[PDB]
Design a protein around this ligand. Structure first.
Ligand SMILES: O=C(CCC1=C[C@@](O)(C(=O)O)C[C@@H](O)C1=O)Nc1ccccc1
Ligand SMILES: O=C(CCC1=C[C@@](O)(C(=O)O)C[C@@H](O)C1=O)Nc1ccccc1
Ligand SMILES: O=C(CCC1=C[C@@](O)(C(=O)O)C[C@@H](O)C1=O)Nc1ccccc1
Ligand SMILES: O=C(CCC1=C[C@@](O)(C(=O)O)C[C@@H](O)C1=O)Nc1ccccc1
Ligand SMILES: O=C(CCC1=C[C@@](O)(C(=O)O)C[C@@H](O)C1=O)Nc1ccccc1
Ligand SMILES: O=C(CCC1=C[C@@](O)(C(=O)O)C[C@@H](O)C1=O)Nc1ccccc1
Ligand SMILES: O=C(CCC1=C[C@@](O)(C(=O)O)C[C@@H](O)C1=O)Nc1ccccc1
Ligand SMILES: O=C(CCC1=C[C@@](O)(C(=O)O)C[C@@H](O)C1=O)Nc1ccccc1
Ligand SMILES: O=C(CCC1=C[C@@](O)(C(=O)O)C[C@@H](O)C1=O)Nc1ccccc1
Ligand SMILES: O=C(CCC1=C[C@@](O)(C(=O)O)C[C@@H](O)C1=O)Nc1ccccc1
Ligand SMILES: O=C(CCC1=C[C@@](O)(C(=O)O)C[C@@H](O)C1=O)Nc1ccccc1
Ligand SMILES: O=C(CCC1=C[C@@](O)(C(=O)O)C[C@@H](O)C1=O)Nc1ccccc1
Lengths: 141, 141, 141, 141, 141, 141, 141, 141, 142, 141, 143, 141
């Protein structure tokens, strides 16, 4: 029972870098927390990260083809990519948009998401735990 | 830990009314779902609903005086009330903003919240499960 | 067949106060006129005024729960209250928004209404006669 | 005791065309309904329609010179024509602006009217009955 | 030198109607004043007025073909007509845009002209004398 | 298949005037080109041009009643006329909006069209060949 | 003689809460200070506070009936309440708007007041002292 | 009749500099042209120029105390100076605003003037002849 | 000559088999064949390429600039977002035709601004897959 | 303590000019009212006025070097001068911004001030007494 | 021939270094004059450094640079965001015009992010402190 | 001290292409100038260009890990990429944004940069010398 967790640009540097903004949990550690949560919930999680929009697009395409759910933290592309929104709008299974930081407590431009209108829902500002909460929503359909 | 769940105007009519927009769970069923989850999590939850902004402020003021966290669905007041923002800004414990519907998939005016900048985080679009995921975040502190 | 006529804040002071803006008809006179008109049309009118948004909401919920039509002059809340729009949006019977003054010949902020998009129709600037015309529309459906 | 009902562009196609938006009553049927109501009220109704802004302006100039009340559904020109607004501004008798459809539940651009600020009042969204309610107002004023 | 003076919608009613706004001089009186001033300057003035945009465009098309200058008071069309701008932009002889009233001392929407950017110049607010002053400019070159 | 090609204000002057902006083809030459291409395609084209909005609306009403497609270059009316949009919105056959010039390489105001949202599609900047391409689209339905 | 000082929502928590933003003076201490100052000026101060818009409207109605001056710190309602502005607009005696904090040094949204254009004057950012200065104004008229 | 012609910053360098924007006529030449024109009209013209806003305000103050008309080319201050507008608003004799260039055919910012709303009228884009047309207007009143 | 490059941007490799209600039922392969058939009618050669990679798109645009060949471009979502793509297209000396399969003016407001239109020779919107074939015929004649 | 009261352009004309807008007190009389009120408070007031922005800046620099507070009515520069704002931001002692008129009951452009965000506070609409109230604030520090 | 370059500083810059030294540095206007004169000597230029709080004085300096056909390095301080008159005087310059801001005007209030001068300037240097003037001088010395 | 000079999309085509916009110096020639100049300064420059946003992010991540300064000409990404801004914001060493062209003398959209607010400084419009000037800044910190 497969859920894709997909992280966009720069997020490979979590924890190690920008800890005051995005937390101390590294990308490897987050993969381990997601896999733990997934197991408890009876799901298989697949965690991917890329700085390449083309790569991200390809993973979304695969998830639309497999009709699998997607938890997506698109990084800066959240606020800028129509191409990413159009790939995501193809998904039939739920799409949960996640932001680690509270985008509403930062610069104004971070308060607009291209993904939110086509997502099932959005979790913002709850740190790493956002991913884990999103998983639990998907376990409940 | 004591967690205050507070619902704003009209939300007493959940499930019985507007089920296409806000779900089929009644307010009474919500309260019991929340108590069930709080028990599992080892928290105590107190859920309250009012159509009166003054009553909402009073509950916020009490959570402020007790340093207790708040999970708040302010209903229409999310987009309109600076008084409620200012009450909420005094809270020292976490404040989680919850919207049952995906306010990003509705009218443009719903895409702006006065609470998000001062909230710890926001959960939108995940139905009644939003309140349960918020509790789970507060349990992990 | 019952029609609810609901007046929002300050409108208890009609006639006696601000006559150059909202006319020289008092709220007591307006109730008697409306009852008179309702009698001739074979309707029953229940006319209620409050300065409290919560009380205005409760009256709207009652019309919703009764599937009775509403003629609403929300006063200042017309331009500010999403909570009120949301309660009115749940009405299954007609809603006619009424403004005594011509809100388009005043400050630009009075030219936007949260109610209009969700109302059946709107009558503006015809004085107290707007309520009587709204009745007659309801009498024919 | 003579009232001019002026319909702007495309409105000769009412009923037989675009029923879902502007209703199933044809322009002929509308003229007949207006004349019947005028008879009931003790008024004479002169109902004219034109696709030409120049012809509409001439009819407005004529009502200005005759000191006759006007009920105007200007159609598209409502949102676009300063010239029509300036012609209306010299009317000494009342001007009632009428829209069949609820212009506030349609494209954002329909929510601005060059006419409303200079009108005695405005009726929107009440269908064809809006002309009949405008007539009744004029009969009582 | 043949100079065309062209007046747009409603200006056939100058002097008689709206004199607090556009002065007390009538359109027949204006023609006379312009003709007299033209004789003094050694020009011939042709003065026309129409409420019909198509008619105004035909007059502009004729001045374009004859390479004759235009003094234009487009009335409300100043703020609204791209088609009139496009016809005026063809003129090879000078175009002088004239407003009797001071459009900057009125509604905000009067402060934008589609004609000013393509005109040789603009005269506003100087009453009927604007036309006479434009004529003298055109005599000088 | 009958196809109506409708040109709006000023476009009677194609080619002999403003050749740098709208090309060297005259209106008479355009009709001939269009007729010869419709002949090759197995279609009959009726080409009409008018500076009068009322006249344009009449031809659009006719195409609606006849269920015939329209290729429309509305000229300046593109950017200004809601009445023209509303008449076009009733067409049941395809509507193709054509602009000879590239309206996106010119003033900011030419970048918005009231017609594009209700057209089947739009061709901009391809010169007179744009009418002939529109014709080929209609030949393939 | 009587001056009405009215404090809006959350201001009962002055002093003991948010001392960095609104000062260390409690609402009880403020009442005492105003009452003493007023008495030294030969005035009698009545100091009110409520979290309920409706109660605030009721106090302003009574000050309008009594033709007494009002010093009003509306809190969050300053930026949001048209109903309050409308009640305040009928006051015949002076209306002084007071803000303890400098609203122009905080979020952009606090730089707009619905009250300031209908107030006699406004004092901002002078702390608790603003209410005492407002009293001294009223003592001079 | 004494008329003051006042030129603002940089205009001492007219004619010699920026001749492609503001013409070839020098400030010395412009003074002699204005003096010759004024003799012809039976007026006295006093022509002054300064780069100093304080000095232009002092001249406007003198024309206010003396109730003398002003022809003002404020140059860049037209778009920026509220202090200059406020001095000019005090003038009881006419105020004619002049721009040598067509400010509507240049950058967007030159299309708003602080002076135009408090001016008697405005003349734009007719080069130096603007000052002469304004003199002639004042000779007539 | 008359070699023309048809370039499709992101997600457009999934034409026809996916989102048929918004972009039509013609597949990318089918579209390549239709354009080739049309190209043979017109006496020109069409090269059709597609990529989800902005850098790849830019490379194809550079190659067209260097070869002074015209381009028919459907940039997909990048139409609305990429200044880099606009700047590469602005170097083109031969014509550039912007094509959208859907009618972008009947959709979300953000789709009604293109960064490419001001620098394109022209734009065809809303005419389905036939927009590419119409752009080819324009190019065959100028 | 030395307090500096600084008046900006045109305020040397107070009283004698524009009486209905800025009151009937002359600048000479304002200076004596201030000096007297300062004595009473045991302060020394220095009151100065200039139409020259460079002069106001010099006075502000001098207060910065002396660590003296300033009461500033900048007149038109309030809404326009970033240089004045930056000079004022250098002040370590309090800065009180004063407007005689209620700038929020006038043109929209006067509702924005460059000074308010850097001033300690602001007093608007209380006439000449606003300076006296500012002085009293400064007496209490 | 020793090329003359005019360095013109607008309002409040005579108080450089009074505050906010993290935004504007701790170097004073007179110390700046000396650093610029020295760098200019090294480059073979002659720097004329002038400062005024009077817009009319700044226009008069710009008028002289226009008549002399001399390059200008301009830090107009607050008038950058407000003065059309200053822009229109600068538009008349035939030699290069380099706009300099000591602070990073894009890291501060939004109203600082618009300059009336940048469109008419040869180019603009921002956020590089006082070194911005010296870099402007070096650009002028090369081209 | 190693300095990274990173050029974004299409800049590999400098000099040979678009010379009227970005100069006659090729990218190879620019690499030449920079390496030399850096050596003169006692620095070592590593100059890289790519059309791939993911490749540019990788080079930024490397400079962030190495604590090395960055001279960045992002090309069109300057106006569009929040992902690039976020990668840059992590740099601890100085970041200098360079534009060869004067972006303020072009289209309005080029006047906004996502990089400038997080950069140390920005050099624009100085052609290729802007890179050399930036190196000289970094030689000094
Ligand atoms: O660049 C980023 C992530 C950017 C980013 C993330 C968010 O989605 C979020 O809160 O998760 C909000 C959104 O506005 C945003 O752009 N991270 C990074 C950069 C360098 C080093 C370490 C981490
Ligand atoms: O009025 C409301 C809720 C209003 C509301 C809720 C949200 O916070 C949310 O999605 O939870 C979104 C927000 O924009 C909003 O205004 N509910 C109701 C009304 C009538 C009958 C039954 C229920
Ligand atoms: O405050 C009000 C009504 C306010 C009000 C009414 C309108 O709906 C309308 O035209 O009916 C327009 C709307 O913009 C508005 O806010 N009335 C009042 C106040 C004091 C004393 C006496 C009467
Ligand atoms: O074109 C129109 C009416 C247009 C119209 C009318 C309104 O005033 C109204 O609600 O009555 C709202 C206003 O926004 C508008 O433009 N009707 C039509 C068109 C084709 C066929 C049949 C009928
Ligand atoms: O309708 C009009 C003139 C309209 C008009 C004129 C102006 O060009 C000008 O000031 O000359 C300003 C412009 O904003 C405007 O719209 N006049 C009219 C109407 C009824 C009766 C008598 C006269
Ligand atoms: O006035 C016009 C056409 C104007 C026009 C046409 C467009 O639809 C187009 O590109 O076809 C774009 C649109 O913005 C516009 O308004 N032509 C003309 C005027 C005078 C003399 C000769 C010809
Ligand atoms: O909520 C408020 C006051 C709010 C408020 C006050 C102001 O009028 C002012 O400066 O006096 C400015 C205005 O923008 C604002 O909204 N106070 C509070 C909240 C929680 C705990 C303790 C005190
Ligand atoms: O600086 C200016 C004139 C400024 C100016 C003039 C206008 O009022 C007008 O057209 O008369 C339009 C207005 O927008 C503007 O700012 N002139 C100058 C500058 C340098 C050398 C020689 C002459
Ligand atoms: O993502 C896209 C194309 C996106 C796109 C194309 C358009 O240029 C156009 O109408 O051709 C309009 C434009 O606004 C847009 O972004 N297609 C896709 C996505 C998933 C599966 C199958 C196809
Ligand atoms: O020009 C002015 C003052 C202008 C002015 C004053 C205010 O600071 C204030 O209310 O005190 C509000 C602010 O908006 C403004 O511009 N006065 C004047 C002019 C001519 C003759 C006599 C007096
Ligand atoms: O007034 C100023 C500098 C003004 C200023 C400087 C900038 O040009 C720059 O970064 O160089 C950016 C620009 O936004 C700005 O206004 N300084 C000051 C004021 C008072 C006391 C001491 C120093
Ligand atoms: O595409 C670009 C650079 C684009 C670009 C550069 C700038 O940063 C700058 O001024 O250096 C300004 C910025 O607005 C921008 O987008 N160059 C190119 C394109 C094709 C062929 C040859 C060269």
């Amino acid at each position: 029972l497969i859920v894709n967790v997909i992280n966009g640009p720069n997020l490979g540097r979590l924890g190690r870098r920008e800890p005051a903004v995005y937390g101390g949990t590294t990308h490897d550690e987050l993969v381990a927390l997601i896999e733990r949560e997934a197991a408890e919930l009876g799901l298989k999680a697949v965690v991917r990260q890329s700085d390449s929009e083309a790569q991200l697009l390809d993973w979304i395409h695969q998830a639309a083809d497999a009709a699998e759910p997607v938890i997506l933290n698109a990084g800066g592309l959240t606020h800028t990519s129509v191409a990413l929104r159009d790939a995501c709008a193809e998904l039939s299974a739920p799409l949960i948009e996640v932001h680690i930081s509270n985008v509403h407590a930062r610069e104004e431009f971070r308060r607009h998401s291209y993904l939110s209108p086509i997502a099932t829902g959005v979790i913002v500002g709850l740190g790493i735990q956002g991913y884990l909460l999103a998983l639990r929503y998907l376990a409940e359909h």
